[PDB]
Amino acid sequence: VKQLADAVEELASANYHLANAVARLAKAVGE
Amino acid sequence: VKQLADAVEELASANYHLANAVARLAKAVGER
Amino acid sequence: VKQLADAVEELASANYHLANAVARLAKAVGE
Amino acid sequence: VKQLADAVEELASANYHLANAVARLAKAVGE
Amino acid sequence: VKQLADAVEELASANYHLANAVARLAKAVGE
Amino acid sequence: VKQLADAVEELASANYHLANAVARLAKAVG
Amino acid sequence: MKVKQLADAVEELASANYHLANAVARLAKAVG
């Protein structure tokens, strides 16, 4: 399952990137 | 399996952060 | 398998929170 | 094993709830 | 093992529902 | 796990389409 | 259990979500 774990880690990193972007959009909308 | 559990925990943390960010966006949209 | 189950339960909780946030966004857009 | 199956079932429930909310957001955006 | 296979099937079904919902959102945003 | 993997693949496709729609919107707003 | 199918699918989802993140960041810049 090591390669699946690696893939899940990649997804976690992508979703952190997405959260950061969504937060920036919230800020832009609210300002 | 511990590596997989660790990875899933990391994804959970990421998704909590995404939920918070989407909630901020809902607030921003609703308050306009 | 216990620790994996516990991690999956945290992911389920996170995705429930995500669902609730998207539901709030749907309400805000719809109104 | 039971704890893991229960956890996966809870993740399925969360993701289904998320799907519903996303579908409602799509409707809100589209109208 | 049955409990887990059943749970995995529920997750697959939820994720298909989620994919369908996101596709509808993409169409809405794209329109 | 074929069914589960296929569902995840469909979600990936959907998010690709969502991303492209959002990028087009960003260009329109700009 | 062919774990490869699932790992490949999760990698594809990660790739899509990085692309989505970039698109959302571009929308944030355009709005602001």
Swiss-Prot record, chains A, C, D, E:
Annotated disulfide bonds: none
Any coiled-coil regions, as ranges: none
Region (Leucine-zipper): 4-25
PTM comment: Phosphorylated by the cyclin-CDK PCL5-PHO85.
Localisation per UniProt entry: Nucleus
Inactivation phenotype: Abolishes recruitment of the mediator complex to the upstream activating sequence (UAS) of amino-acid starvation responsive genes. Decreases RNA level of genes involved in amino acid biosynthesis and cofactor biosynthesis during amino acid starvation or methyl methanesulfonate stress. Growth dependent on amino acid supplementation. Sensitive to amino acid starvation. Sensitive to purine starvation. Decreases cellular glycogen levels during glucose starvation.
Stimuli inducing this protein: Translation is induced by amino acid or purine starvation, or during growth in low or poor carbon sources. Translational repression during nutrient-rich conditions is dependent on four uORFs (upstream open reading frames) present in the 5'-UTR of the mRNA; these promote ribosome dissociation. Translational induction occurs in conditions reducing translation machinery efficiency, leading to ribosomes scanning over the uORFs, and increased translation of the mRNA. The rapid translational induction is followed by transcriptional induction at later time-points, independently of the uORF sequences.
Cited function: Master transcriptional regulator that mediates the response to amino acid starvation. Binds variations of the DNA sequence 5'-ATGA[CG]TCAT-3' in canonical nucleosome-depleted 5'-positioned promoters, and also within coding sequences and 3' non-coding regions. During nutrient starvation (low or poor amino acid, carbon or purine sources), it activates genes required for amino acid biosynthesis and transport, autophagy, cofactor biosynthesis and transport, mitochondrial transport, and additional downstream transcription factors.
Swiss-Prot record, chain F:
Inducing stimuli: Translation is induced by amino acid or purine starvation, or during growth in low or poor carbon sources. Translational repression during nutrient-rich conditions is dependent on four uORFs (upstream open reading frames) present in the 5'-UTR of the mRNA; these promote ribosome dissociation. Translational induction occurs in conditions reducing translation machinery efficiency, leading to ribosomes scanning over the uORFs, and increased translation of the mRNA. The rapid translational induction is followed by transcriptional induction at later time-points, independently of the uORF sequences.
Changes after translation: Phosphorylated by the cyclin-CDK PCL5-PHO85.
Compartment(s) where it occurs, according to its Swiss-Prot or TrEMBL record: Nucleus
Residue span of region Leucine-zipper: 4-25
Source organism superkingdom: Eukaryota
Disruption phenotype: Abolishes recruitment of the mediator complex to the upstream activating sequence (UAS) of amino-acid starvation responsive genes. Decreases RNA level of genes involved in amino acid biosynthesis and cofactor biosynthesis during amino acid starvation or methyl methanesulfonate stress. Growth dependent on amino acid supplementation. Sensitive to amino acid starvation. Sensitive to purine starvation. Decreases cellular glycogen levels during glucose starvation.
General function of this protein: Master transcriptional regulator that mediates the response to amino acid starvation. Binds variations of the DNA sequence 5'-ATGA[CG]TCAT-3' in canonical nucleosome-depleted 5'-positioned promoters, and also within coding sequences and 3' non-coding regions. During nutrient starvation (low or poor amino acid, carbon or purine sources), it activates genes required for amino acid biosynthesis and transport, autophagy, cofactor biosynthesis and transport, mitochondrial transport, and additional downstream transcription factors.
Curated annotation (Swiss-Prot), chain G:
Disruption phenotype: Abolishes recruitment of the mediator complex to the upstream activating sequence (UAS) of amino-acid starvation responsive genes. Decreases RNA level of genes involved in amino acid biosynthesis and cofactor biosynthesis during amino acid starvation or methyl methanesulfonate stress. Growth dependent on amino acid supplementation. Sensitive to amino acid starvation. Sensitive to purine starvation. Decreases cellular glycogen levels during glucose starvation.
Record localization: Nucleus
Origin superkingdom: Eukaryota
Span list, region Leucine-zipper: 6-27
Induction section of the entry: Translation is induced by amino acid or purine starvation, or during growth in low or poor carbon sources. Translational repression during nutrient-rich conditions is dependent on four uORFs (upstream open reading frames) present in the 5'-UTR of the mRNA; these promote ribosome dissociation. Translational induction occurs in conditions reducing translation machinery efficiency, leading to ribosomes scanning over the uORFs, and increased translation of the mRNA. The rapid translational induction is followed by transcriptional induction at later time-points, independently of the uORF sequences.
Post-translational modification: Phosphorylated by the cyclin-CDK PCL5-PHO85.
Cysteine disulfide links: none
Physiological role: Master transcriptional regulator that mediates the response to amino acid starvation. Binds variations of the DNA sequence 5'-ATGA[CG]TCAT-3' in canonical nucleosome-depleted 5'-positioned promoters, and also within coding sequences and 3' non-coding regions. During nutrient starvation (low or poor amino acid, carbon or purine sources), it activates genes required for amino acid biosynthesis and transport, autophagy, cofactor biosynthesis and transport, mitochondrial transport, and additional downstream transcription factors.
The encoding gene: GCN4
